[PDB]
Amino acid sequence: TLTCKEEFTVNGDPVKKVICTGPNPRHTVPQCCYGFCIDLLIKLARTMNFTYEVHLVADGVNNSNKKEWNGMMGELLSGQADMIVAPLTINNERAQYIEFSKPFKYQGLTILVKKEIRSTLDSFQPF
Amino acid sequence: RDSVPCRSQPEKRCCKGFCIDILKRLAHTIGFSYDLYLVTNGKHGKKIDGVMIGEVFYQRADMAIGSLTINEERSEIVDFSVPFVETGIMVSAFLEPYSPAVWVMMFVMCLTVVAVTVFIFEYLFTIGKSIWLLWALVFNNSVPVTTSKIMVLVWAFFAVIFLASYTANLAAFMIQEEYSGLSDRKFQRPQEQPPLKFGTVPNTEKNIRSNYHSYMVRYNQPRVEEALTQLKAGKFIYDAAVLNYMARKCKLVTIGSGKVFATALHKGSRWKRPIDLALLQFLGDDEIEMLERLWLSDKIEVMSSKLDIDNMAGVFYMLLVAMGLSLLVFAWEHL
Amino acid sequence: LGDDEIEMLERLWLSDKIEVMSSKLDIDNMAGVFYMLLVAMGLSLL
Amino acid sequence: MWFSWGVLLNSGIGRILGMVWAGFAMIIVASYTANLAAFLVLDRITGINDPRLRNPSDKFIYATVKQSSVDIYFRRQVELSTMYRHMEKHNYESAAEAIQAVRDNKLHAFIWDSAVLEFEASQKCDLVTTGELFFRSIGMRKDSPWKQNVSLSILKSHENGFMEDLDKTWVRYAPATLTFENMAGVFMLVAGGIVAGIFLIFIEI
Amino acid sequence: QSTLWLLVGLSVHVVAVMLYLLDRTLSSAMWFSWGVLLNSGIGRILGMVWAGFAMIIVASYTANLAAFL
Ligand SMILES: CC1=C(CC[C@H](C)CO[C@@H]2O[C@H](CO)[C@@H](O)[C@H](O)[C@H]2O)O[C@H]2C[C@@H]3[C@H]4CC[C@]5(C)C[C@@H](O)CC[C@]5(C)[C@H]4CC[C@]3(C)[C@@H]12
Ligand SMILES: *[C@@H]1O[C@H](CO)[C@@H](O)[C@H](O)[C@H]1NC(C)=O
Numbered sequence: 001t002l003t004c005k006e007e008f009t010v011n012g013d014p015v016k017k018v019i020c021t022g023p024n025p026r027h028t029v030p031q032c033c034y035g036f037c038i039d040l041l042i043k044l045a046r047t048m049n050f051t052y053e054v055h056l057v058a059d060g061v062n063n064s065n066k067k068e069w070n071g072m073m074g075e076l077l078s079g080q081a082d083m084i085v086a087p088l089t090i091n092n093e094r095a096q097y098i099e100f101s102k103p104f105k106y107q108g109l110t111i112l113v114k115k116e117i118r119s120t121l122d123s124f125q126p127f
Numbered sequence: 128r129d130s131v132p133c134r135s136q137p138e139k140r141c142c143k144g145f146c147i148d149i150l151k152r153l154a155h156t157i158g159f160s161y162d163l164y165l166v167t168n169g170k171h172g173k174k175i176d177g178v179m180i181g182e183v184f185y186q187r188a189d190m191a192i193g194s195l196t197i198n199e200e201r202s203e204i205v206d207f208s209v210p211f212v213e214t215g216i217m218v219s220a221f222l223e224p225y226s227p228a229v230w231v232m233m234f235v236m237c238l239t240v241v242a243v244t245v246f247i248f249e250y251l252f253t254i255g256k257s258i259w260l261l262w263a264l265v266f267n268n269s270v271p272v273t274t275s276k277i278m279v280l281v282w283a284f285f286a287v288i289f290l291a292s293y294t295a296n297l298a299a300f301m302i303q304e305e306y307s308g309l310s311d312r313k314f315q316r317p318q319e320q321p322p323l324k325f326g327t328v329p330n331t332e333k334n335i336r337s338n339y340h341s342y343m344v345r346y347n348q349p350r351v352e353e354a355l356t357q358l359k360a361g362k363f364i365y366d367a368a369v370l371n372y373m374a375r376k377c378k379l380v381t382i383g384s385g386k387v388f389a390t391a392l393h394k395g396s397r398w399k400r401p402i403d404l405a406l407l408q409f410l411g412d413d414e415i416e417m418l419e420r421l422w423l424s425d426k427i428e429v430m431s432s433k434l435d436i437d438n439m440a441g442v443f444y445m446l447l448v449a450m451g452l453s454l455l456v457f458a459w460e461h462l
Numbered sequence: 463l464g465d466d467e468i469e470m471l472e473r474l475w476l477s478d479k480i481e482v483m484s485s486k487l488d489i490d491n492m493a494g495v496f497y498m499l500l501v502a503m504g505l506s507l508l
Numbered sequence: 509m510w511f512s513w514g515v516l517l518n519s520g521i522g523r524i525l526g527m528v529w530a531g532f533a534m535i536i537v538a539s540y541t542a543n544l545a546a547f548l549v550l551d552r553i554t555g556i557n558d559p560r561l562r563n564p565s566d567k568f569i570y571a572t573v574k575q576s577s578v579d580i581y582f583r584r585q586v587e588l589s590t591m592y593r594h595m596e597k598h599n600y601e602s603a604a605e606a607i608q609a610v611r612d613n614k615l616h617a618f619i620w621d622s623a624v625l626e627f628e629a630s631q632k633c634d635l636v637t638t639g640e641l642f643f644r645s646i647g648m649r650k651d652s653p654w655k656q657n658v659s660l661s662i663l664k665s666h667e668n669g670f671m672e673d674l675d676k677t678w679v680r681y682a683p684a685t686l687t688f689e690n691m692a693g694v695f696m697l698v699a700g701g702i703v704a705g706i707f708l709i710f711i712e713i
Numbered sequence: 714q715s716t717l718w719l720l721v722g723l724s725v726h727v728v729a730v731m732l733y734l735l736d737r738t739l740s741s742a743m744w745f746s747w748g749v750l751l752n753s754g755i756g757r758i759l760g761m762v763w764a765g766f767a768m769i770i771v772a773s774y775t776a777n778l779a780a781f782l
Contacts, residue, residue, distance in 0.1 A: 010680065036674035043670060044661055048654070060576050060602060071576075072647065082648030082655070087621075089577035090645045092407030099648040100407075102202075102659035105623070105671065106213050106390065108641030109578075112625040113552050113617045114610070115636030119684040122693065123483045123547050124288055199663040203656075210644075222683060224769065229687045232694055239698055246705065250712060262761045267768040268518045271749055271756045274701075274708035276510055276521065281701050283519045285694045291541055293772060294779070295548030296685050301780035310672070338665055390668055411645065412584050430781060438716060438773050445769070446720075449762045450727070456759065457734075473587045477563060483547060491539050498532045506525050520754065 004032040016042065022056020029056075037085050040104065055080060060088075072097050135165030145422045146192050149414075156405050161190070171195060173333075182393050191391050195331055196366065205394030208403050210410065212371070215387030217327075217364035218380045219300060220440035225293070233289075237265060243278055250274075304426035307381075311335070311364075311388040319343045327364040329353070334389060364388075372423055553617065555640050561617075564590050571606050571618035572598040578619060581643060611635075627679050720770070721750055724763060731760070 001019070009015040020033030033054065045052050055078070059070045067073055072094050075084055082099070087107065090100060131151065133142025142163060154161055164181070166172060171193065172180030179201050181188025196214055197207050244257050263270050264282070267290055309315045313324070319342035330348030335341055350356065353373065356363055360378055364370075367387065374380050392398055406414075514522045516533060553561045553568075560568045572578055572595040579595060582588040598615075600606050606618050607628060618625075622641045629637040648655050661667065725743040732742050748756045750767060 010677065036678060039674065040670070043667075044658065047661055048657060060574055075647075076649065082652040084647045087646075089580065090407075091411070091577065091580055092404050092409075093580060094647065095407045096404050099650050099652075099655060100403075101646045101648060101655055102208070102662055104646060104662050106215075106387070106644065108622040108644040109581075109619060110622040110625050110641055111553070111617045111619050111638045112607070112610075112629055112632075113636055113638065114613050114634075116552075117682075117684070119550075119686055120689065121482060121547070122686055122689050123487075124291075124544070124693065125483070125487070127485065127488060197663070199660060202663055203660055223773075225685060226683060229685055232691050236694065236698065243701070243705070250709070259757065259761075263764060266764060267771070269752045269768065269771065270520070270764070271745075271754060272520065273510060274705045276514060277704050277708075278701055279519060279521050280513065280517055281697050283517050285697055287518060288690065288693070290772075291544040292686050292690055294541070294775070295544060296683060297772065297776040298545065298548045298779050299682065299684070301776060334665065339669075388668075388672070389665070411581065411643070415642075415644070434777050435716065437777075438770070441769060441773060442716070442720075442766075445766045446723070449765070453727075453731075453759050453762065473562075477559070482550070487543050490543075491536070494535060494539065495532070498535070502528045502531070506528065 001030070001032045018054065020054045020056065022054075023058060041083065052083070131163050133163045133165065136167055145418060146194060148417065148421055150192060152413075152417075153402060153405060156409060157401065164188075173201075186393070186395070188393055189395060191393055193391070194368075196334065196389070197391075198334060205392065206399040207391050208399055209391035210406065210414075212368035213387065213390040214331075214366035214368035214370075215390035216367040216383055217370060217386070219303060220437065222300065223297075223437075223441045225296065230289075233265075236285075237261075240278075240282065243274075247275065305428070308383055308386040311338070319345055326350075326359065329365050331366050375424055552636070552638060554638055556642055561591075564594075567616065569598065569610075569615035569617065570594055571600075571610065571615045573603065573606075573620065574599040574601055607632075627681075630679060631681050717750075720766075721747060724750065727763070728760075 004017050004019060007015060015034060016039060017032045017034035018038060019030060021028060021030040023029065033056075041052060044050065057070055057074055067077075071084065071086075071088055074080075076098060087103075087105070090103070094100065129148075130141055130143040131147050133140065147163070150161065150163075153159075166180055168183075169180075172183050174183050178184075179191070179195075180193050182191060182205055191205065191207060194211070197209070201207065240261055244254075244261060248254065248257070260272065263272055268283070268287070307314050312318065318340070326349075327342065328346030328348065329350035330346055332346070336344070336346070350363070350365075353365065353369065357378070367389070370380065371382065374382055392402065511522045515530070518537065552558075556562070561570055570591055579592070579599075582592055582595065600609070603618075603620055603624060606615070606620075609615055610618055617638075622639070625637055626639070629635055646658060648658070662671075724746045728742045728746050729739045733739070745756045749764070752771065
């Protein structure tokens with residue numbers, strides 16, 4: 001930001017982008033964050049008049065083996081409310097950990113690659 | 128084998144299915160007894176007027192296996208966490224000759240051939256004749272009509288080579304295969320129908336009935352049974368999961384997963400989290416192969432009049448432009 | 463064994479029509495070259 | 509010799525048994541064209557079943573994430589240990605990092621959520637995706653009743669509509685003619701013709 | 714069989730108009746064009762232009778044969 005930039009969306013209505021603070025050493029970056037998930041959070045808050053906030057995450061039993069997860073464990077330890085941003089993991093372990101709400105969307109897993117291409121070898125040959 | 132005791136309400140009948148398979152797998156994972164009752168009232172036993180199937184009352188039943196979708200009003204009374212399809216959503220011309228900047232070699236070769244002709248009319252009285260020879264020869268061998276012969280020999284060589292390359296390119300071209308989401312309607316078309324192609328009224332269906340008047344509330348249950356649609360192929364929308372199941376069964380039907388426009392237990396507490404954890408822990412591995420094997424389970428083209436529309440792609444462009452150019456020089460040079 | 467064992471082994475462990483060109487074209491066209499050439503030579507010479 | 513040379517090369521620029529000779533010409537030409545057609549006729553994992561993804565591969569890279577969710581999903585299947593082994597060397601901070609890394613083709617492929625890759629490829633009109641979803645699958649602490657509301661919040665058809673609106677908002681964004689080497693062939697042929705013409709003028713005087 | 718007959722008729726008409734207004738025959742021109750359209754030698758500022766289409770159309774036909782092949 002400069003304060004967050006204001007710009008009309010493709011349809012013309014403004015595209016919300018709320019002040020969102022967290023790590024980018026140790027320096028706190030109060031950037032501006034936006035996305036469909038943010039809009040969903042806005043809808044929820046308008047539905048139950050929440051007083052929301054936000055906080056970026058640091059990252060995505062001999063000595064330490066269990067309490068090491070970033071998203072779920074970080075949310076539980078840091079005291080952040082039950083609100084979480086991205087679907088990320090949806091499994092039994094994270095479920096028993098805290099909870100899983102009804103799936104806002106149904107998704108799976110796939111792969112992305114670089115598409116191939118080039119004809120050669122006229123052989124119209126040296127013979 | 129693998130069936131289950133099953134009664135509806137003193138006669139018992141063979142009873143089993145994918146729902147039964149998942150129920151028994153869950154029971155084994157939890158070692159819980161059960162009773163496989165059956166519907167008695169209505170096709171869904173819904174709380175139509177404040178009277179789901181077994182939970183129309185508060186605690187009439189103790190489970191829920193109805194494959195029908197999960198709603199708000201249905202869900203807001205009893206938790207019904209479960210995974211399934213969610214049944215959301217339903218029912219060469221230009222590149223013929225070649226690319227332009229590939230045969231520039233042919234233009235330059237025409238110029239060099241012309242020059243070579245200029246290099247032969249003082250070596251042993253034929254320019255217009257030589258000009259016609261060149262022009263009519265520029266094309267394939269089919270034509271009505273010692274450097275002198277060597278130049279023609281090399282000319283024919285790369286001409287036939289280019290023709291063979293064109294044959295290979297068109298062989299690649301012809302080898303080709305073949306076979307719309309904006310909203311719940313038919314690609315932003317009017318709410319209901321412009322009264323053409325009427326359908327999608329199966330009377331789930333109530334879920335879209337309360338939607339933004341459900342095609343003018345013009346659903347008199349024309350669909351009736353789903354299989355009745357078999358005749359209706361090219362003379363429709365419904366629960367997408369069952370639509371896909373019918374599609375699996377020829378009858379090509381609109382099948383779009385991305386669309387998903389429209390998107391299992393009683394209210395008894397102390398049962399949601401257990402089975403939810405059980406499925407989230409074990410389901411992820413077995414469940415897909417289980418369903419597909421147990422249940423819920425083309426580049427070919429010959430010929431048509433498509434050849435006519437295809438050669439029309441490379442017919443008019445030449446014929447009409449030639450007519451225009453010829454007529455332009457017909458009424459122009461004559462004065 | 464009869465059920466699991468084969469998939470077990472193959473997954474766990476224990477796990478072409480393409481041709482471009484060659485001088486095969488010469489031996490190939492020799493298939494339909496000599497038969498005509500030599501027979502024509504003899505038929506003309508007789 | 510000149511007449512025969514012309515005859516052998518399909519041009520009209522040019523007797524009890526001569527026709528017999530003509531015979532071979534026809535077939536040989538066909539043969540040549542046939543081989544051209546034989547030359548003319550020719551030609552990813554496209555699913556987890558691809559052995560390259562399953563069997564170890566030095567070249568092919570089955571990229572992974574930083575033990576977020578895929579690690580758990582793969583630890584269930586023991587056979588993926590080798591892949592999990594590769595997972596030890598294919599765990600990066602963010603999916604954007606993996607995308608940027610593979611843009612250069614250093615990593616053959618990466619496995620991730622269907623939607624994320626789908627819309628990134630939508631943005632990335634330069635790459636190719638495989639689709640073929642295979643593992644169809646907001647949280648909260650177990651002390652907030654708001655959970656129900658949240659579920660109730662999203663269950664609405666007027667809500668699925670907002671999701672579709674977001675989808676509209678975000679998801680909105682082989683001739684191979686030989687020609688070139690054929691070009692070189694024609695250029696060297698015209699060079700041969702030029703030198704032949706120089707020879708012809710040399711013999712002329 | 715429509716394309717062949719219609720195109721040969723059109724070519725006969727165009728060559729006939731080319732000759733008639735430049736000759737002051739129709740059947741002789743029609744026969745010559747019919748022969749030209751069918752790859753035989755049994756048979757002028759812009760006539761070559763017509764010749765053009767011949768080549769490509771033949772290829773097209775053969776192409777479909779290969780597509781059929
Ligand atoms: C070998 C040739 C091609 C090939 C092109 C194809 C026929 C198809 O046409 C191409 O289609 C592509 C795909 O749409 C487009 O991208 C291209 O714009 C378009 O050129 O052009 C032709 C035009 C020219 C004629 C027209 C008359 C003149 C211009 C002047 C007269 O005094 C007599 C001489 C001359 C130069 C005459 C001689 C031959 C020629 C150079 C012709
Ligand atoms: C809106 O939220 C506020 C919280 O301060 C609450 O007092 C109020 O009752 C809410 N209004 C409605 C209509 O829910």
